[PDB]
Design a protein around this motif. Structure first.
Motif, PDB file in Angstrom:
ATOM      1  N   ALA A 153       0.811  -1.198   0.000  1.00 16.53           N
ATOM      2  CA  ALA A 153       0.000   0.000   0.000  1.00 16.53           C
ATOM      3  C   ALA A 153       0.878   1.297   0.000  1.00 16.53           C
ATOM      4  N   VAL A 154       1.929   1.313   0.831  1.00 21.84           N
ATOM      5  CA  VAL A 154       2.794   2.441   0.940  1.00 21.84           C
ATOM      6  C   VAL A 154       3.428   2.717  -0.413  1.00 21.84           C
ATOM      7  N   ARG A 155       3.949   1.679  -1.064  1.00 20.86           N
ATOM      8  CA  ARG A 155       4.501   1.805  -2.408  1.00 20.86           C
ATOM      9  C   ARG A 155       3.481   2.295  -3.452  1.00 20.86           C
ATOM     10  N   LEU A 156       2.247   1.797  -3.382  1.00 19.67           N
ATOM     11  CA  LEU A 156       1.208   2.238  -4.305  1.00 19.67           C
ATOM     12  C   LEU A 156       0.826   3.706  -4.101  1.00 19.67           C
ATOM     13  N   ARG A 157       0.753   4.100  -2.830  1.00 19.07           N
ATOM     14  CA  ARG A 157       0.490   5.472  -2.439  1.00 19.07           C
ATOM     15  C   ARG A 157       1.558   6.415  -3.039  1.00 19.07           C
ATOM     16  N   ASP A 158       2.817   6.109  -2.749  1.00 19.31           N
ATOM     17  CA  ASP A 158       3.967   6.897  -3.145  1.00 19.31           C
ATOM     18  C   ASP A 158       4.129   7.011  -4.646  1.00 19.31           C
ATOM     19  N   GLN A 159       3.998   5.880  -5.335  1.00 15.70           N
ATOM     20  CA  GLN A 159       4.073   5.885  -6.791  1.00 15.70           C
ATOM     21  C   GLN A 159       2.824   6.471  -7.468  1.00 15.70           C
ATOM     22  N   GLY A 160       1.651   6.299  -6.863  1.00 19.34           N
ATOM     23  CA  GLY A 160       0.415   6.874  -7.409  1.00 19.34           C
ATOM     24  C   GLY A 160       0.381   8.407  -7.378  1.00 19.34           C
ATOM     25  N   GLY A 161       1.063   9.020  -6.402  1.00 21.14           N
ATOM     26  CA  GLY A 161       1.079  10.478  -6.212  1.00 21.14           C
ATOM     27  C   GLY A 161       1.481  11.254  -7.447  1.00 21.14           C
ATOM     28  N   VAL A 162       2.430  10.687  -8.188  1.00 20.63           N
ATOM     29  CA  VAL A 162       2.962  11.267  -9.428  1.00 20.63           C
ATOM     30  C   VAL A 162       1.956  11.181 -10.585  1.00 20.63           C
TER      31      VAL A 162
END
Length: 121
Positions: A99-108
């Motif tokens: 989830a943390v990775r999806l959050r961080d990468q989704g932001g862009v």
């Protein structure tokens, strides 16, 4: 009326843009941890914990049903997926961590899609 055809011409295309955004976000989940709804056969108590389940296959159905009015509606669903996971699963887990990775990468991706809705109209 013709003014409902032109309204739909915007919706149709928002759907058409929202499709692309979904695809890029779902590529940031190569493990497919968020592809399908959480199984109530496998986690029978899930709804005791998460009152509004969300997943990619669910988000897709509603997109092809031109069921999203704006980009804020789509962004809320996306956040459920992450925030639900981050509550259900403890911090030291492949699920939480994903989830943390999806959050961080989704932001862009989302940071540009806001700009493409606003700019197109």
């Amino acid at each position: 009326s013709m003014e409902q055809v032109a309204m739909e011409l915007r919706l149709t295309e928002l759907t058409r843009l929202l499709r692309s955004v979904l695809d890029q976000l779902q590529d940031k989940d190569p493990a497919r941890i968020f592809a399908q709804p959480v199984s109530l056969k496998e986690v029978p108590d899930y709804l005791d914990h998460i009152k509004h389940p969300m997943d990619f296959a669910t988000m897709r159905k509603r997109l092809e049903a031109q069921g999203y009015k704006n980009l804020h509606e789509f962004e809320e669903d996306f956040d459920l997926i992450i925030d639900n996971c981050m509550k259900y699963n403890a911090r030291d887990t492949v699920f939480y961590r994903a989830a943390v990775r999806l959050r961080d990468q989704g932001g862009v991706v989302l940071r540009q899609a806001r700009r493409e809705v606003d700019s197109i109209g």
